[PDB]
Amino acid sequence: MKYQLPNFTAETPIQNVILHEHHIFLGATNYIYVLNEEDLQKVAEYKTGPVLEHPDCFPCQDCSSKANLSGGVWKDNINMALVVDTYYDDQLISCGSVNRGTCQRHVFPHNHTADIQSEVHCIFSPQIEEPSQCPDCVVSALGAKVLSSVKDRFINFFVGNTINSSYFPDHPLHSISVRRLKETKDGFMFLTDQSYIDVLPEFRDSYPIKYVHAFESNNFIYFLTVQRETLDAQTFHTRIIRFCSINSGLHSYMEMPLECILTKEVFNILQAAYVSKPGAQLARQIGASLNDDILFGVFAQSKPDSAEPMDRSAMCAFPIKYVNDFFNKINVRCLQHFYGPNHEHCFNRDEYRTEFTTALQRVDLFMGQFSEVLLTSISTFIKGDLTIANLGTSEGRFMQVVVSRSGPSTPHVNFLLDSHPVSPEVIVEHTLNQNGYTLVITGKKITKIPLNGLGCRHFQSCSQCLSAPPFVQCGWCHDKCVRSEECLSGTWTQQICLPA
């Protein structure tokens, strides 16, 4: 028995979601679907693939005409980034796996937000200055995390790329990079050589780096990664990268591990992360103000000396003020995957790249309630004095549960959304008096789940409804169990069950 909520089924998988001007932009395989916010009805679509690959057919130059070729290969366009620029003339910047991870700006016509096909420009400018570099080569097909920030009157792009040995002539990709988009909007550009920090070519395969989440807070950029503990190490880590939010380069770069213990068993692999403010009750228990940015992270146990999750999940909260306090404390190593583990730089003491010796540890807020499921999505919100967590399963179950340390909480919403796992990429929209919705991706389906009300629909009879946990605020409305505001009739009680 399941709920009827606005859904949308795409012809291919959904990779990234964006919400802009009452329009849902989906980043799908070979498509960019454009839905309507209210009903999730496909208003437009843009065909992004398949795209034909040829060792001479360069990026941003079409070759549908070169179909019958001695070395031709049909590739799929898997969306890696989807960014909405509103600083310059409103445009959707989209990036795919193909064309050497080139991006494209879909300029919106002045009165039609749904028109994604009219103005489309490919961000590529042939590098004459130093043909040894590629700033228009943003994204990797392996894994990519893009973060847009207007800073010093320019649109800066912080990038996290997953690499392999695959060497490229004149077109390489960078591990962590900061590039500013030119006002001519024809290309990007790295200001200095400092602007990027790559894994040494020896380690490109031995050391795979998964960039789980990226965010900006308190004048700093932060990246959340899944990498090895050390070069020679056989086991996997979750790290918190941080660097002074500047345009010219990656300054005051630092990486520290994060530990999610259960009191000393470790859930070493971050599956999803969400940064939000805390509700009053939990704020008190984590030592945070109502206005403190908090990194909530859903972690998983890794198969011994592997990186794949184990269906044993947890969730711990990292108040960024505390995360920052750790970085501002003095011991410390050199960045072993970027610098040489043996090089002269590592032994000395902006300019340098720090790796932290110890970790920041936090206990599972759910106290092992999820140690027998695989949590893949997280989104947090505030209800009154409460902090509710929206959680997705690898099994395709979506659940809402109260985040508190003052005794464990059972989820008040729990149901199968689809069969396919839940996507970490979520959307939380907020409306007046704490009641919006989430956007949950499950393969080729995107679902619009309301923040408060689903708890009530789990009660079939008035008697069942009348004895619901008080916080869900459930009442009977003639023939249904719903919140006060959802009852448009006047027959709302939490005390009476008339005859039937």
Binding site: T86, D89, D152, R153, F154, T184, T192, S248
Partner: protein, 219 residues
């Protein structure tokens, strides 16, 4: 006469324009400095061409001793040149407006620079766009209600529709004639698109910072 034009060179390549306001001082933009290593900077005066071609009896090339950054708001920077610029027929200073001043709407202005021109084979010679002063209120609307201006900003609409500064033009001046005299009223800074028809350009109000500018430059 364009004696006050300065070309800022970062790693032997032109990065920005600037303006000689006093013998040892150049007024430019914070965007013009990718590095804190002054070694990589050089200022060229006496030039008309970006590569300093026909300029050799004129060309003056100075090192940068100091970087005095303007207030948190402004994207301004004052450069102290390692040795005073010699004021000859080819090199001259530009006057500043007074602190408690303003310029009438529709006052004619010019933006100068060796920046992007959208031309195929650009000859590297100094360019000029003709602009006219506009009210901050009518300029905020013209931007489609996307940007609101401070007292530290100044608007100037284009006289030839598709015109305006771009990449490589930053730090350069907005010259207007206040009381029959050429004055630097604005500093070119990045915008929200290079030369958009009917959309005006935001510069930074030099007059707003004239107190600070004179505080530095007057040792």
């Amino acid at each position: 006469n364009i004696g006050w034009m300065v070309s800022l060179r970062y790693r032997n390549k032109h990065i920005c324009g600037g303006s000689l306001i006093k013998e040892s001082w150049v007024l430019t933009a914070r965007q013009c400095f990718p590095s804190r290593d002054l070694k990589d900077y050089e200022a060229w005066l006496g030039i008309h061409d970006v590569h300093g071609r026909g300029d050799e009896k004129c060309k003056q090339v100075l090192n940068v001793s100091q970087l005095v950054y303007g207030p948190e708001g402004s994207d301004l920077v004052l450069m102290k040149l390692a040795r005073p610029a010699v004021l000859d027929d080819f090199v001259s200073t530009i006057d500043l407006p007074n602190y408690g001043s303003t310029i009438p709407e529709k006052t004619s202005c010019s933006v100068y620079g060796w920046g992007y021109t959208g031309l195929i084979n650009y000859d590297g010679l100094l360019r000029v766009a003709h602009l006219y002063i506009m009210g901050n209120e009518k300029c905020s609307q013209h931007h489609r209600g996307k940007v609101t201006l401070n007292e530290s900003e100044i608007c100037a609409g284009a006289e030839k529709i598709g015109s305006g500064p771009c990449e490589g033009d930053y730090g350069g001046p907005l010259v207007c004639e206040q009381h029959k005299m050429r004055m630097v009223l604005g500093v070119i800074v990045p915008g929200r698109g290079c030369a958009i028809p009917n959309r005006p350009g935001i510069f930074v109000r030099v007059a707003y910072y004239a107190k600070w500018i004179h505080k530095i430059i007057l040792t």
